[PDB]
Amino acid sequence: DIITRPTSDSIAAVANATKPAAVVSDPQSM
């Protein structure tokens, strides 16, 4: 199999802390 390893927790914490929603429901969307 191909090799992977988890990143350090601190890296993951920052990355997960910034993930805006891709699709947001608003009434004015053309």
Partner 1 sequence: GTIVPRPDGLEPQLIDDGNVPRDIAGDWVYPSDVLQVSVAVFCDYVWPM
Partner 2 sequence: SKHLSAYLDSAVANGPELIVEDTGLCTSFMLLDNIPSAHLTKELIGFTWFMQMYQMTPPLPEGAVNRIVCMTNWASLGDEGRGLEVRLPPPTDSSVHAYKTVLSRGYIDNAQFNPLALRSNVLLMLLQFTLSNLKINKSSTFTSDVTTITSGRMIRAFEGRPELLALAYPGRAVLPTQTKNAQFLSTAIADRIGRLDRANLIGGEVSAMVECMELCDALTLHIRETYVMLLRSMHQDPTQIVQIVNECANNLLNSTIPISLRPTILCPWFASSEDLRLQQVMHLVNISSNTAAALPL
Partner 3 sequence: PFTRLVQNDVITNVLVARVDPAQRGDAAVDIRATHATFAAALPVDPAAIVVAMLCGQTETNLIPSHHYGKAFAPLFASNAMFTRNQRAVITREAFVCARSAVAQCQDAGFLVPRPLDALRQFDVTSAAAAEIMHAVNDAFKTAFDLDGALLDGLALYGDPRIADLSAAYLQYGGNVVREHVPPGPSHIHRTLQQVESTFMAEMNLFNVARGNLYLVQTATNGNWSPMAPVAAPPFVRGGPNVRVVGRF
Chain positions contacting partner 2, by CB under 8 A:
8-11, 13-15, 17-21, 24-28
The encoded tokens of residue 22 equal 């891709």
The encoded tokens of residue 12 equal 């993951």
Q: Helix, strand, or coil here: 13?
A: helix
Which of 7, 28 has the CB closer to partner 1?
Answer: 28
22 makes contact, choosing from partner 2, partner 1, partner 3, none, with CB < 5 to 8 Å by partner type, with partner 1
Task: Give CA separation, 28 vs 16, 24, 25, in Å.
Answer: 29, 11, 9
2 makes contact, choosing from partner 2, partner 1, partner 3, none, with CB < 5 to 8 Å by partner type, with none
